[PDB]
Structure 1
Amino acid sequence: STIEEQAKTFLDKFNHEAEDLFYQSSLASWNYNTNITEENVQNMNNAGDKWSAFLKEQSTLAQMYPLQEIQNLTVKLQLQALQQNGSSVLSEDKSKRLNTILNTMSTIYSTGKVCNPDNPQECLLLEPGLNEIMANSLDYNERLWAWESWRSEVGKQLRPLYEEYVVLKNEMARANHYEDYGDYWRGDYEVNGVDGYDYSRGQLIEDVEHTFEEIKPLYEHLHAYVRAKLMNAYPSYISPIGCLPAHLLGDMWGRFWTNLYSLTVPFGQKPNIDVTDAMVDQAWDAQRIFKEAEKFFVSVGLPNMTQGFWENSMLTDPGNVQKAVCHPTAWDLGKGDFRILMCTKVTMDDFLTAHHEMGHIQYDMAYAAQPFLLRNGANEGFHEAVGEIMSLSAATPKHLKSIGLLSPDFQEDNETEINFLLKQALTIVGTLPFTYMLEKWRWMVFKGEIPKDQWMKKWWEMKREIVGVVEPVPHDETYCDPASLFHVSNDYSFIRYYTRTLYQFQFQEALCQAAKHEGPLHKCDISNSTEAGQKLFNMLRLGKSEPWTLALENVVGAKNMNVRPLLNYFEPLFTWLKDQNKNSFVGWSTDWSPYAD
């Protein structure tokens, strides 16, 4: 009689009908990625539209069950996502024009290219063409030509398409009773209905801004060290208290500094840990690479992989006849069908990536018993965070020596680990400032605090203050830097990468306390320890059915994000960088510019 019984009935029949259409929609995309054919391209659109229109048809009946009469927390969470109308709230024109802007901006990104200034005939596309050249390019002009010329025909041309994306998406948030479109993404962390665990959407701006203050002393030292090694190349453009060029970050957008690890090696007289030459002599293939990782999850207590998982895996690309995307991805369809599509070579990274790609599959097995709408991570940062903790355990010399990759007589000391922390710091400490910088800028533009003319004026003004990077060539409001980015042009969440660093480290410190490991954190290894797996498995099966604030307390015992695990794991590196920076100036100034003298 009560609306509760009617709501639970609508939710029971929704999981069955949605599981069949969702599985066929994901299955169609699998055959399209594994094999490029005219039949798979159409099946992805038909199966994709059938499932896309399914939620639109169910959303009409979901708004007829108010959440005020529902006293069940698990019931409101399932209807919380269905209550949203998506693009239905937008006008007929604004709703159809939105997909045209997303498809137009996404097409220019893949079709965009920059012709070689020295070779006008040869014109290389950004990916891989422009992303690979900028990685190993040490030239100042060669890197500036592709970096400066890209945003000229892209950043400038995407400005009118980006303006519509800002106005169109705002109309959707306002129709949803949201302060703005920026608050739309913060809704993933929204927590309500539980006394004391409530997490407001606006509290994210204060947490990300409060936690970033503690990372400054660690990043300032890491930035001063990188500027000292590269200061001998161009002392005029690189000031001691200034900032590093924007095109010298090692790649197009300067997201990860790992490419600079070669020249930033503190000690070049000592060997480095690599499994490439060790795996070659062992004569291992893609078939035994995943098998070795499957035994790791069993040592911690996690169930093994189903027979269909290993049988349906795609270990390589059979030439150009049948082509697939080598980009590692973990595909979860449904009905217990788990698969991974990746191109498997013999490298030290593929071994670490195998644990990451398998972490997503292993993570999907815990909450697989939850309802369709209840199957998901507690937030957008837990997806890749659970997979990083698995890779961090394999990179430790203790895990490598266990399976026999690294020689048992390999000497492990400060000089050996100090070089390892620097490699992980560039990929970790390097993305944090860039993530908080770009993510915070989008929130200000969407909120309306930055006029359209100040988009670029505030972009570089906040860049030197956050990441300490200055533009070699000044730009006007015509250019759009985020327009060229992959996540910004594809309408994907860019904040999930910032929180992933804080979440992956919290679990690393908590899981090692259960296994009773002593010494530095980077020396911890969760293998052979079945006590840490039982504690992490509890939250793995919860998913988003429970507030992420509550599930996070059962693991690390914290009700919010904390930077403490970031300082301890990087503590040994901070102590060494502090001494090497005594001869230099720690930090940078925002009053220095390469074109302003």
Structure 2
Amino acid sequence: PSTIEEQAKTFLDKFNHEAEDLFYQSSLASWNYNTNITEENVQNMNNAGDKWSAFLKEQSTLAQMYPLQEIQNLTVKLQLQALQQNGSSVLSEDKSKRLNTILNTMSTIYSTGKVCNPDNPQECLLLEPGLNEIMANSLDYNERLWAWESWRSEVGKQLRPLYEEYVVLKNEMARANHYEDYGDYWRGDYEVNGVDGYDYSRGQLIEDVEHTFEEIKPLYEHLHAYVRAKLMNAYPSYISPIGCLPAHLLGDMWGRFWTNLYSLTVPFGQKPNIDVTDAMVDQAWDAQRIFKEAEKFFVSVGLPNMTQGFWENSMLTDPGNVQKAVCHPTAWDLGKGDFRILMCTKVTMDDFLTAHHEMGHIQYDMAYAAQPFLLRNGANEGFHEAVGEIMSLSAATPKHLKSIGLLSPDFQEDNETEINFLLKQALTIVGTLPFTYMLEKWRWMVFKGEIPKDQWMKKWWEMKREIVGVVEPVPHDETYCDPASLFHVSNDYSFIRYYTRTLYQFQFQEALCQAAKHEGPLHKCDISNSTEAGQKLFNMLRLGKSEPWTLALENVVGAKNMNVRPLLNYFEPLFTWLKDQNKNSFVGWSTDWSPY
């Protein structure tokens, strides 16, 4: 007897038990390092992590010995294939070492790249923070031009040949693992097979993204015309009223987020933005009260409260002078019932929203905990951060801020500040969608081999001009590699997660607000006190990744496919207001322009 399926269940049981212990070891080591930067904890973290890595590699070999061909329980088959991923080990050991050397080399070039001003060969400035504040707080076109070109010259020129060989080796790696290129490997995250009615080819991702972006284009054109107008005011002789926006003027080194330009593009400058930070500091509000209010929100929708492990083992304030710790807000699921949040909370509204966002991460973790270890995660690469953002958006609504007391009982909105809020929100959210699409498309076509190498630094900008609507301030030969200058491109991170997450979070929020019976514009909906939206979200959160992403999407928003319509339905008021304010502006742009 002893069918293969039974044997695989036994193996997976042994794994799900010993793994949990080792993952807890490594998670707790990482936590003690990030809450106390001492070399000893550093070493213990590295040791625990390498031991966990060896365990997973060995178990991966032993699981690959099982045959996915003869297993008829998907809940088992998914865990098996997930551990079966052989990875870069299929490459020649020499080639594997070369690839990993290139990865760490480019990452260290990025994290150790600096531009030395010709003003003083002794003085220099790194990406973080010198160049970043130069590109995010200055208006002098000449300085910003220098910084853009300097970081793309000293760093990108170096990252070029390494990324070339990187393309070669990653292509070989994915071809071995039976993927048409490394881009196919990246797109295989949304791959669903063997479940009729919910399967999703690895190219249906491409089609759905392109078609949804077609539906997004108009809002981005009017936002581009309006932003071009305000910037044309800012810089009196540097952008064509029909031309692509320049690069070193977009708000950051790459132009991925236009949020900074808010200071120069606010529709009604006299109308101040809503910030309760002072009100918080003046009502004895402590970080304790911040996280208690977060707990209260997630409780009011129905979800459970934070376990006492969170209220006792989490660092919710900066430790002090003696200790040194990471402060990037992180959600930690160490497993075995231990959930924590690392955040150096300050009494500001930003940290209030971020606390809700990270506690939404935590609630999602708590829900998918009953599942097996391999199946403890988000439905895809963009589900988590989307959940966190729907928490932030439900919070920021003036209705919610009124309810919690951080707002007056009769604070009456004004259409001008709703325009400002929607405009800031669109500068961040809507502005980054074309950037993400363009960059990920460049990588995708490069991995397919459609873009010859000698035409790399060319095609990029063409797409940059034809999709993003941005012109290069300077002509670049192929000795450059401005792509690689982003943190995600040289550090080998799939990108499309953010585009997806955006569309996801808006679909989620609209469905939940439907369950919560909110009327009016979508940006004013608060899921607070609504038990039904909580139950629906939990029906999605509990599944983790035991069922396909399409099924969880249907469990919340009520559909099997991605759809931009919730996002546009959220930003429609701003869309009308843009169209109005751009009546006397050309909407669109022209490739031809270029300050050279």
In the alignment, the residues of structure 2 paired with residue 316 and residue 247 of structure 1 have an alpha-carbon distance, to the nearest angstrom, of: 36
In the alignment, the residues of structure 2 paired with residue 264 and residue 320 of structure 1 have an alpha-carbon distance, to the nearest angstrom, of: 39
In the alignment, the residues of structure 1 paired with residue 330 and residue 507 of structure 2 have an alpha-carbon distance, to the nearest angstrom, of: 24
In the alignment, the residues of structure 1 paired with residue 129 and residue 332 of structure 2 have an alpha-carbon distance, to the nearest angstrom, of: 23
Structure 1 residue 584: Cα displacement: 0.4
Structure 1 residue 235: Cα displacement: 4.1
In the alignment, the residues of structure 1 paired with residue 319 and residue 405 of structure 2 have an alpha-carbon distance, to the nearest angstrom, of: 31
Structure 1 residue 517: Cα displacement: 1.0
Q: Deviations over 1:223-253 (max 9, x none)?
A: 1101101112334320111011101111111
1:341–1:132: structure 2 CA closer, same or farther, 3 Å change rule? farther
The answer as to whether partners of 2:368 and 2:541 remain within 8 angstroms in 1 is yes
Structure 1 residue 163: Cα displacement: 1.6
In the alignment, the residues of structure 2 paired with residue 431 and residue 421 of structure 1 have an alpha-carbon distance, to the nearest angstrom, of: 15
Partner of 2:487: 486
Structure 1 residue 320: Cα displacement: 5.6
The answer as to whether partners of 1:159 and 1:480 remain within 8 angstroms in 2 is yes
TM-score norm. by structure 2 comes to: 0.98
1:565–1:83: structure 2 CA closer, same or farther, 3 Å change rule? same
Structure 1 residue 23: Cα displacement: 1.3
The alignment partner of 2:234 has SS state of coil
Structure 1 residue 271: Cα displacement: 3.0
In the alignment, the residues of structure 1 paired with residue 331 and residue 166 of structure 2 have an alpha-carbon distance, to the nearest angstrom, of: 29
The alignment partner of 1:282 has SS state of coil
Partner of 2:143: 142
- The CA RMSD measured in Å over matched residues stands at 1.3
Partner of 2:414: 413
Structure 1 residue 322: Cα displacement: 2.3
4+ long deviations beyond 6 Å = none
In the alignment, the residues of structure 2 paired with residue 172 and residue 21 of structure 1 have an alpha-carbon distance, to the nearest angstrom, of: 28
In the alignment, the residues of structure 1 paired with residue 517 and residue 38 of structure 2 have an alpha-carbon distance, to the nearest angstrom, of: 53
Structure 1 residue runs of 5 or longer lacking an equivalent are: none
The alignment partner of 2:89 has SS state of helix
Structure 1 residue 179: Cα displacement: 0.7
Structure 1 residue 319: Cα displacement: 4.8
In the alignment, the residues of structure 2 paired with residue 479 and residue 383 of structure 1 have an alpha-carbon distance, to the nearest angstrom, of: 35
Q: Deviations over 1:508-561 (max 9, x none)?
A: 110011111111111111011111100110110101110111111111111110
In the alignment, the residues of structure 2 paired with residue 376 and residue 233 of structure 1 have an alpha-carbon distance, to the nearest angstrom, of: 46
The alignment partner of 1:262 has SS state of helix
Structure 1 position 105 matched with structure 2 position 106: yes
The answer as to whether partners of 1:273 and 1:406 remain within 8 angstroms in 2 is no
Structure 1 residue 39: Cα displacement: 1.1
The alignment partner of 2:261 has SS state of helix
Structure 1 residue 291: Cα displacement: 1.1
The answer as to whether partners of 2:397 and 2:526 remain within 8 angstroms in 1 is yes
The alignment partner of 1:114 has SS state of strand
In the alignment, the residues of structure 2 paired with residue 527 and residue 550 of structure 1 have an alpha-carbon distance, to the nearest angstrom, of: 25
The alignment partner of 1:338 has SS state of strand
Structure 1 residue 87: Cα displacement: 2.0
Structure 1 residue 426: Cα displacement: 0.7
The answer as to whether partners of 1:117 and 1:145 remain within 8 angstroms in 2 is no
The answer as to whether partners of 2:191 and 2:202 remain within 8 angstroms in 1 is yes
Structure 1 residue 169: Cα displacement: 1.5
In the alignment, the residues of structure 1 paired with residue 323 and residue 162 of structure 2 have an alpha-carbon distance, to the nearest angstrom, of: 35
Q: How does 1:59-138 map to 2 (within 5 A)?
A: 59-138=60-139
Structure 1 residue 581: Cα displacement: 0.5
Q: Deviations over 1:60-112 (max 9, x none)?
A: 11122212211111011111111111222111111122221121111111111
Q: Deviations over 1:265-322 (max 9, x none)?
A: 1112323211112112113222221111110000000101011112222234345642
The alignment partner of 1:519 has SS state of coil
In the alignment, the residues of structure 1 paired with residue 342 and residue 30 of structure 2 have an alpha-carbon distance, to the nearest angstrom, of: 11
Structure 1 residue 22: Cα displacement: 1.3
Structure 1 residue 578: Cα displacement: 0.6
Structure 1 residue 136: Cα displacement: 1.1
The answer as to whether partners of 1:272 and 1:416 remain within 8 angstroms in 2 is yes
Q: Deviations over 1:160-192 (max 9, x none)?
A: 221222122222111111111000011110001
In the alignment, the residues of structure 1 paired with residue 409 and residue 144 of structure 2 have an alpha-carbon distance, to the nearest angstrom, of: 42
Structure 1 residue 115: Cα displacement: 2.2
Structure 1 residue 434: Cα displacement: 0.7
The answer as to whether partners of 2:234 and 2:264 remain within 8 angstroms in 1 is no
In the alignment, the residues of structure 1 paired with residue 90 and residue 327 of structure 2 have an alpha-carbon distance, to the nearest angstrom, of: 37
Q: How does 1:236-251 map to 2 (within 5 A)?
A: 236-251=237-252
1:332–1:177: structure 2 CA closer, same or farther, 3 Å change rule? same
1:278–1:119: structure 2 CA closer, same or farther, 3 Å change rule? farther
Q: Percent identity?
A: 100
The answer as to whether partners of 1:366 and 1:537 remain within 8 angstroms in 2 is yes
The answer as to whether partners of 1:375 and 1:543 remain within 8 angstroms in 2 is yes
The answer as to whether partners of 2:327 and 2:342 remain within 8 angstroms in 1 is yes
